[PDB]
Amino acid sequence: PIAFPFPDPPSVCELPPELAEIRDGQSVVEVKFPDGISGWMVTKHADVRKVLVDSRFSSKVMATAAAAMSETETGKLMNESLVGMDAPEHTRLRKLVTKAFTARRVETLRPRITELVGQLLDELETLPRPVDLVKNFSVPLPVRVICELLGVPAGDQDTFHAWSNALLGDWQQVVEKEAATVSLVNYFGELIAVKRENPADDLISELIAISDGDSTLTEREIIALSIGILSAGHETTANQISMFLVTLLHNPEELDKLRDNREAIPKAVDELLRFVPLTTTGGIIPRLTTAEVELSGGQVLPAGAVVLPAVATANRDPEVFEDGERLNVTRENNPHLAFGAGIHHCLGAQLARIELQEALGAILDRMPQVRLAVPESELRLKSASIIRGLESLPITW
Numbered sequence: 001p002i003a004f005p006f007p008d009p010p011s012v013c014e015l016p017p018e019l020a021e022i023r024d025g026q027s028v029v030e031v032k033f034p035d036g037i038s039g040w041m042v043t044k045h046a047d048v049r050k051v052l053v054d055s056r057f058s059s060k061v062m063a064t065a066a067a068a069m070s071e072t073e074t075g076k077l078m079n080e081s082l083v084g085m086d087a088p089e090h091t092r093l094r095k096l097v098t099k100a101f102t103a104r105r106v107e108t109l110r111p112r113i114t115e116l117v118g119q120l121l122d123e124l125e126t127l128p129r130p131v132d133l134v135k136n137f138s139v140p141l142p143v144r145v146i147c148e149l150l151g152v153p154a155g156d157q158d159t160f161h162a163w164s165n166a167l168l169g170d171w172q173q174v175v176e177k178e179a180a181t182v183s184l185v186n187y188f189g190e191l192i193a194v195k196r197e198n199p200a201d202d203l204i205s206e207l208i209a210i211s212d213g214d215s216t217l218t219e220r221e222i223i224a225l226s227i228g229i230l231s232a233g234h235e236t237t238a239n240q241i242s243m244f245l246v247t248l249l250h251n252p253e254e255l256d257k258l259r260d261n262r263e264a265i266p267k268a269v270d271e272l273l274r275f276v277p278l279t280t281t282g283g284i285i286p287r288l289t290t291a292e293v294e295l296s297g298g299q300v301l302p303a304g305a306v307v308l309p310a311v312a313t314a315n316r317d318p319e320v321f322e323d324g325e326r327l328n329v330t331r332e333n334n335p336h337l338a339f340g341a342g343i344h345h346c347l348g349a350q351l352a353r354i355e356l357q358e359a360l361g362a363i364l365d366r367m368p369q370v371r372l373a374v375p376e377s378e379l380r381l382k383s384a385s386i387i388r389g390l391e392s393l394p395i396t397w
């Protein structure tokens with residue numbers, strides 16, 4: 001039985017070597033949480049992917065923690081989200097939301113997103129001396145963008161700005177997250193009303209129209225969905241941007257490939273998505289098995305058991321990715337699991353990609369001599385929260 005969480009290595013740029021040790025040895029392992037209880041972790045791409053794709057696993061591992069709230073908004077909402085549903089229930093929702101959350105909407109949103117970035121860089125360029133990229137760019141952009149998509153804007157945004165950061169909270173800070181949540185549930189309750197009697201081209205405007213029409217889609221679901229989207233896409237993207245730049249700056253010979261060559265970027269982004277993970281599980285909530293399961297390597301996972309898809313290392317599996325533990329931004333073959341797989345596959349997978357693309361491009365393009373205001377050594381990740389995020393990222397150029 002192995003101790004999980006693992007040790008957190010010295011560098012922010014390295015991972016627990018314990019991960020590769022397992023993936024290339026026993027591959028499947030059982031683990032114990034402090035807590036005491038026994039779980040299981042899979043490490044192979046095949047296996048990880050099976051866990052997410054196979055329908056004998058369940059994402060209902062928080063179902064009592066949410067009932068045990070419930071009565072807070074936080075808990076009402078853990079019960080109401082996609083990422084926590086299964087079976088038919090999840091299918092109905094995902095289906096309903098995609099009637100408006102489509103690749104097309106997202107594709108068409110790229111131009112705005114470019115401006116949203118340009119603008120934040122326009123403010124970045126009038127701030128003084130070394131400047132923290134986290135506070136001033138990485139944390140704000142994805143909300144802006146989620147706002148633009150939802151139909152919040154654009155007054156209302158210096159308020160939202162508060163509620164949103166409250167949720168960036170270090171996961172222990174429950175009372176302060178519970179507060180913002182509530183402000184948001186009412187805020188969106190209101191926004192609906194106004195969007196209904198003056199729609200525009202945005203996610204909510206569309207959902208209402210669906211909901212008002214001939215469909216079971218209710219205002220509450222819309223609200224849940226709208227927040228689900230925020231929580232899910234905010235911390236996430238914000239962390240990655242910073243991490244990515246760091247990683248690039250760490251590998252200057254791989255970064256030089258993206259200089260003066262903007263068509264190289266979509267590939268670069270997917271390589272970092274692969275190589276630079278959210279967590280060990282790549283932000284994926286542990287699945288628990290609804291029944292017993294046979295794996296690639298022969299091992300069998302028992303029914304009623306917690307399972308950790310360890311995406312962080314499955315995305316370096318040498319069976320799949322040739323030269324996997326090194327960053328190749330030219331990589332053409334790269335079927336990474338950063339956005340998961342199976343029915344829970346990131347709803348914002350394309351959007352994320354666009355944001356990240358647009359962000360790098362703009363930085364490279366407008367601030368190409370961008371160096372860390374020094375140094376790799378001093379960087380430090382956030383104690384809590386859960387996602388691998390930098391506390392700050394002072395940069396100069």
Ligand SMILES: CC[C@H]1/C=C/C=C/C[C@@H](C)[C@H](O)[C@@](C)(O)C(=O)[C@@H](C)[C@H](O)[C@@H](C)C(=O)[C@@H](C)[C@H](O)[C@@H](C)/C=C/C(=O)O[C@@H]2[C@H](C)[C@H](CC1)O[C@]1(CC[C@H](C)[C@H](C[C@@H](C)O)O1)[C@H]2C
Pocket residue numbers: 004005033065066074078171172174177231232279281283284285286386
């Ligand atoms: C890598 C797995 C972690 C999942 C992260 C998922 C992130 C998704 C992303 C959308 C956000 O971070 C988030 C919205 O989901 C999120 O942060 C929420 C979970 C947020 O924390 C929210 C539920 C809370 O405020 C949280 C404090 C809850 O109120 C609290 C009741 C959670 C209790 C809890 O026991 O769960 C923790 C949690 C899953 C955490 C972390 C789980 O810790 C748990 C899981 C991991 C460790 C090993 C143990 C095991 C546990 C599953 O038994 O303790 C595990 C026990």
Ligand code: HEM
Pocket residue numbers: 052059082083084094228229232233234236237240278282283284285337338339340341343344345346347348349351352
């Ligand atoms: C780098 C950025 C992002 C990464 C790495 C990421 C990764 C993931 C992963 C791994 C899952 C699956 C979790 C699970 O299987 O339990 C997921 C689900 C989800 N993602 Fe993201 N995501 C990112 C950004 C976004 C953004 C910007 C949105 C915006 C709308 C979004 C929409 C959410 C939603 C709503 C789900 C749940 C879908 C469902 O369960 O059916 N994500 N994400």
